[PDB]
């Protein structure tokens, strides 16, 4: 009793809105289940087999994407300037963090 949506649909040649109107938006829809399918692909678990490893990659690619979009002619975005300032300050901070410990010796 109280079946899920995956035993309900059984057909996947359609658009999302049709299925919405046919299974979840009908007045007679019993809607008596909540079960989120596992969407991670095995072709990705076999290489990143750890939530920490799946999060480090998910953050590295996020940083890459945020670098690529900010690097017709508007160019007047505060986020590009913020990323530039952050990169410059990070470079200048690591600069005075290796030399400072070179001096202390």
């Amino acid at each position: 009793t109280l079946r899920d949506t995956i035993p309900d649909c059984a057909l996947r040649s359609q658009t999302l809105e049709s299925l919405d109107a046919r299974y979840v938006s009908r007045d007679g829809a019993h809607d008596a289940a909540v079960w989120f399918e596992d969407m991670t692909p095995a072709e990705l678990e076999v290489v990143f087999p750890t939530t920490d490893a799946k999060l480090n990659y998910l953050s590295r690619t996020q940083r890459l994407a945020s670098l690529l979009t900010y690097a017709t002619p508007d160019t007047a975005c505060v986020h590009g300037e913020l990323l530039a300032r952050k990169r410059e300050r990070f470079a200048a901070v690591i600069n005075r963090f290796l030399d400072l410990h070179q001096i202390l010796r």
Binding site: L2, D4, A32, A33, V34, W35, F36, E37, D38, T51, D52, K54, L55, E88, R89, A91, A92, V93, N95, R96, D99, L100, I103
Partner: protein
């Protein structure tokens, strides 16, 4: 007695599609994916709604909802009736067998903290403190403003005491107790660093005249004794004529809202609270300063009352207590602004961190007293009880006439005036310290330098005056920052016949040294001689610099076409560009973008003081300035403007 309803919930075995290799168990909820632990937006909501059950009802607040902490756990009736008809899946049998075990076992370590008397001691201490301060500290029985208020330091002291006593009496629960004391002090969202700060020992307090200094420590002790079991709070003081009042005010309430049978009292010495099962905790008074306090067993507090003028020959027992392994010498004090600097303790701020805290109402600069104005208590605001006899004056002129150190006191006259006049510092102390300490070695990182030197000379053409110094700076670009290669603060010999050449010889000597230290680095040196003082004298300096340098890098001068003239003179006129130059400098300096060369050159500032240290003393006057002006302007020139030439 059983607490709230958040630690008794049933299983709610919804479902999971994640492999057991990933799933984690959050207490109070089922078993969810591992990604729900690196997301604080969930692991900080699912954990706060748990410890919001251990918190008693006398600690939620004063208007928090009748039955629950509405600000954390409240669902509208419509939403409750809507999520009621929401039904998850049902866990598979082979998966529900271990899931229920994991769930009811990860929750047992909470229904086990709610029972241990070691934690019940802390809960009782905090709840009694709250319920007994509700009506301000008085002779109540413990059975329009009507609720008492702890000022800021009266709360910092309570936190310093409670967090340490919890970390000491509860070591096996150093995680379930931090995130409970957070909820009990209404201090969540607080990183573990700024809470572990309260775990440290020997945190000195400097308090103004009265501020309920003594009125607060006696209830603190009375509740920290009759709640915990196995601590001996040492309470030293000044001359022991002041400690007997503490005796009486502790034992009056300690016997007032409790039974006298458990109140053990000997005159002039220790006081002891006994518990109905062979337990006793005392407040043994180290005020004798002779014996009975050298051997330490469970002191852990050492409530030193007044460390302003330390008691004679009583520092030996204190320093011996500092050797005890679990002692947190609270070190209360009272600088009543009658001296404003208990330099016996105030010198601690020199080399230390997170040690002492001052409850001050006037800053270092006595002009921005309005910084801490809305914080000064309203009870201590009494005046002559008459604004004016007959006068119509605004609050500004009234407070000017009625200044009296802004607190009816007789604070130090001089220095920072009474009318603030929008006076503030400009360069942060932190950037200043880094300017002093981190100095790139330019002679060995020459590849990082731009091939142009910029020099500014800000001349003074008098002698035998303190403002008669000539400032010289030679700077350049280092990466995208600015670095100082040389500094001079030069003082004319009196009645020389050649002041411009003396100044020129000074700058040429500086340049030469900079050039020799970095051979082949520079293609150009650009020189600006400020001409505000004397155009002719500035021109003469440029001419001598020009000639002397003629004995490679090309030498260019900034030129100026004075108003109404067609002539280009080799001087610089400082006017409209001052404000932009200063503004840019301040921003660059504060962000770490201006520095001094490790091998910075100075002939004139070498024997008495470090040149960078000397420059920084001038710079800290931003709100004799020849050096500061030369440095700021040399940098502005290295920055961007109109072209200077040959």
């Amino acid at each position: 007695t059983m607490g709230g309803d958040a630690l008794r919930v049933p299983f709610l075995d919804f479902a999971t599609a994640t492999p057991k290799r990933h799933q984690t168990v959050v207490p109070g909820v089922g078993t969810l994916h591992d990604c729900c632990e690196h997301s604080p937006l969930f692991s900080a909501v699912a954990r706060r709604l748990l410890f919001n059950s251990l918190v008693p009802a006398q600690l939620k607040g004063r208007d928090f909802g009748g039955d629950h902490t509405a600000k954390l756990e409240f669902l509208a009736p419509e939403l409750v009736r809507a999520v009621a008809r929401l039904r998850f899946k049902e866990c598979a049998p082979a998966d529900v067998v271990p899931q229920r075990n994991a769930y009811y076992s990860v929750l047992n370590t909470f229904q086990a903290l709610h029972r241990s008397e070691a934690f019940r001691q802390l809960v009782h201490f905090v709840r009694d403190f709250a319920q007994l301060l509700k009506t301000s500290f008085r002779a109540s029985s413990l059975t329009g403003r009507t609720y008492g208020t702890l000022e800021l330091f009266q709360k910092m002291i309570l936190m310093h005491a409670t967090y340490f006593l919890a970390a000491v009496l509860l070591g096996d629960h150093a995680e379930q107790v931090n995130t409970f004391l957070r909820l009990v002090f209404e201090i969540p969202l607080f990183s573990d660093a700024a809470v572990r700060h309260f775990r440290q020992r020997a945190t000195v307090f400097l308090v103004p005249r009265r501020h309920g200094k003594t009125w607060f420590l006696v209830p603190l002790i009375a509740l920290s004794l009759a709640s915990f079991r196995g601590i001996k709070i040492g309470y030293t003081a000044h001359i022991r004529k002041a400690t007997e009042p503490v005796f009486e005010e502790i034992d009056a309430c300690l016997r007032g809202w409790f039974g006298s049978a458990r109140v053990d009292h000997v005159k002039g010495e220790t006081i002891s609270f006994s518990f109905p099962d062979g337990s006793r905790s005392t407040i043994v008074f180290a005020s004798s300063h002779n014996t009975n306090g050298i051997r330490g067993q469970d002191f852990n507090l050492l409530f030193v009352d007044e460390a302003n003028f330390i008691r004679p020959d009583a520092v030996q027992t204190i320093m011996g207590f500092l050797n005890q392994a679990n002692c947190k010498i609270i070190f209360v004090s009272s600088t009543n602004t009658g001296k404003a600097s208990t330099s016996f303790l105030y010198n601690l701020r020199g080399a230390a961190d997170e040690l002492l805290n001052v409850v001050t109402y006037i800053c270092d600069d006595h002009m921005p007293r309005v910084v801490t104005h809305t914080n000064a208590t309203a009870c201590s605001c009494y005046i002559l009880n008459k604004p004016v006899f007959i006068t119509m004056d605004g609050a500004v002129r009234r407070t000017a006439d009625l200044f009296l150190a802004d607190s009816f006191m007789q604070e130090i006259i001089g220095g920072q005036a009474r009318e603030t006049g929008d006076d503030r510092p400009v360069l942060t102390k932190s950037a200043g310290e880094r300017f002093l300490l981190y100095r790139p070695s330019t002679t060995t990182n020459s590849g990082l330098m731009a091939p142009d030197l910029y020099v500014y000379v800000d001349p003074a053409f008098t002698a035998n005056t303190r403002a008669s110094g000539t400032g010289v700076a030679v700077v350049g670009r280092y990466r995208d920052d600015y670095i100082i290669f040389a500094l001079e603060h030069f003082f004319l010999r009196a009645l020389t016949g050649s002041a411009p050449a003396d100044i020129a010889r000074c700058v040429v000597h500086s340049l030469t040294q900079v050039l020799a230290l970095h051979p082949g680095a520079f293609r150009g040196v650009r020189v600006a001689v400020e001409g505000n003082s004397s155009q002719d004298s500035a021109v003469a300096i440029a001419t001598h610099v020009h000639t002397e340098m003629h004995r490679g890098p090309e030498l260019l001068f900034y030129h100026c076409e004075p108003p109404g003239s067609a002539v280009l003179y080799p001087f610089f006129l400082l006017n409209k560009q001052k404000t932009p130059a200063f503004e840019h400098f301040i921003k660059k300096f504060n962000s770490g973008g201006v520095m001094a060369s490790q091998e910075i050159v100075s002939a004139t500032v070498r024997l008495q003081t470090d040149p960078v240290e000397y420059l920084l003393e001038q710079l800290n006057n931003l709100t004799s300035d020849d050096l500061m002006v030369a440095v700021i302007m040399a940098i502005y020139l290295a920055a961007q403007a109109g072209p200077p030439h040959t």
